[PDB]
RNA sequence: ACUUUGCUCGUUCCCGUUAUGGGAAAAAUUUUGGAAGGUCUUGGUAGGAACGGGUGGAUCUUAUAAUUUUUGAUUUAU
């Protein structure tokens, strides 16, 4: 926070001051490419002779 | 159901009589509604009503199931 990027005074950007970084933690879900519904939806036909 | 008729019973009063009948009505009792008064409690005490609009914001319907939120690509799959 040496400069200001804002409008405001640098008194009142002191006052922004924001809480420190995030830490960081390992993700439990899936990465973005292996995202995906089901395939593999069998077809319909089987159901309609039994 | 309405109208007339005598008989039997009946809440209360009177009479013919206390077998029973006739007449009157809640005027005695209760429940329901309202007015007034008493007692106890609980809350308020500076705004309120009526009218009004090229007035703000909420909710609802329709555009709107077509890439930026709600009409499916995060049950890890074959």
Redesign the pocket.
Known sequence: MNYNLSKYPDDVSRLFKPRPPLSYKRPT???YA???????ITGVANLLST
């Open positions: 879900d899936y990465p292996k995202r995906q519904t089901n395939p593999n």
